[PDB]
Write a protein that binds this ligand. Structure first.
Ligand code: HEM
Ligand SMILES: Oc1cccc(F)c1O
Ligand SMILES: Oc1cccc(F)c1O
Length: 289
């Protein structure tokens, strides 16, 4: 199964920068959401969940087809709460109806990372909407009540290695868990992208507690939280090495996250040899906007 990127007709960097800017301006405007976290973190999760359905074995799922717009996928229990991201993006979809759904969802994640002072994430256009019958079934996204071996095996399906897994999980320094969505509660409630996930793992005093949904989670003296799968990154010696690396080198972490996140968002997509080079969007701050 081949999905060839096809540039939206006549569109170029300037067009997508406009879309980026509209998302970024709305991120700034809609500041109240989730107790003033704003929509950045949920947009990042949305980009990841639309991409994370991919299966390297048969090229099913993946960001290309924009299939989250269909009920089977938007009602996946694994996707509970992402409807907030979808609603945020609705007015952008309306202003720019030419951008494909996969392009929009993934560009929402790029924009969020950047505007939250994260690394630049190069991004390619050309995802093409595919029909409802191409929507992947529920159950391809990961469980949180599992161990390091589960995580490692899980991410092999997405063609991610240990370094890529550990880098991607640094996004758990964004936002929070919400009991009603996932059965976990708490987190940093951060909206600025840092390597704090790694520092907190190493430096906080963690206790394994049960939350109000009767699930186990790791809670810190100082008010942070880690899922069992997060904490597994310091229980496995290979992951622990990499955690320490990223805790001690912000720039390395940013660079590795950027590569892994772009890869995640592009899995399944064949880019023609004469496709445009990836775009690197300027932040509103860089533009003086
Ligand atoms: C083993 C893999 C992972 C598991 C089990 C996992 C699980 C979870 C869960 C249970 C939540 C809370 C959802 C809620 O209650 O609202 C969450 C939130 C989040 N996840 Fe993950 N996740 C994983 C990997 C990733 C990756 C790879 C990224 C992106 C690179 C990501 C980004 C996020 C973000 C940004 C949030 C916060 C959303 C918000 O504040 O609304 N996660 N994740
Ligand atoms: O209908 C939509 C709303 C938000 C984002 C999209 F990509 C849509 O197709
Ligand atoms: O463990 C977490 C997962 C997602 C977001 C957070 F803030 C967390 O502490």
């Amino acid at each position: 199964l081949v999905h060839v990127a096809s540039v939206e007709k006549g569109r170029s960097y300037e067009d997508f920068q406009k879309v980026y800017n509209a998302i970024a301006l709305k991120l700034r405007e809609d500041d109240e959401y989730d107790n003033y976290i704003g929509y950045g973190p949920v947009l990042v999760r949305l980009a990841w969940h639309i991409s994370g359905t991919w299966d390297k074995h048969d090229n099913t799922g993946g960001s290309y087809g924009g299939t989250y717009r269909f009920k089977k996928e938007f009602n996946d229990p694994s996707n509970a709460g992402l409807q907030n991201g979808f609603k945020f993006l609705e007015p952008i979809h309306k202003e720019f109806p030419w951008i494909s759904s996969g392009d929009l969802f993934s560009l929402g994640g790029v924009t969020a990372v950047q505007e939250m002072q994260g690394p630049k994430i190069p991004w390619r256009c050309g995802r093409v909407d595919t029909p409802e019958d191409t929507t992947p079934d529920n159950g391809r996204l990961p469980d949180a009540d599992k161990d390091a071996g589960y995580v490692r095996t899980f991410f092999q399906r997405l063609n991610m290695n240990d370094r890529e897994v550990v880098a991607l999980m640094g996004a758990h320094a964004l936002g929070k868990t919400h009991l009603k969505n996932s059965g976990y509660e708490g987190g940093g409630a951060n909206n600025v992208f840092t390597n704090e996930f790694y520092l907190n793992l190493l430096n906080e005093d963690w206790k394994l507690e049960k939350n109000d949904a009767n699930n186990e989670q790791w809670d810190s003296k100082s008010g942070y939280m880690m899922l069992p799968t997060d904490y597994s990154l310091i229980q496995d010696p290979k992951y622990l090495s990499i955690v320490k690396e990223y805790a001690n080198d912000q720039d390395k972490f940013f660079k590795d996250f950027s590569k892994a996140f772009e890869k995640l968002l592009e899995n399944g997509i064949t880019f023609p040899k004469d496709a445009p080079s990836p775009f690197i969007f300027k932040t509103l701050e860089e533009q003086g906007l």
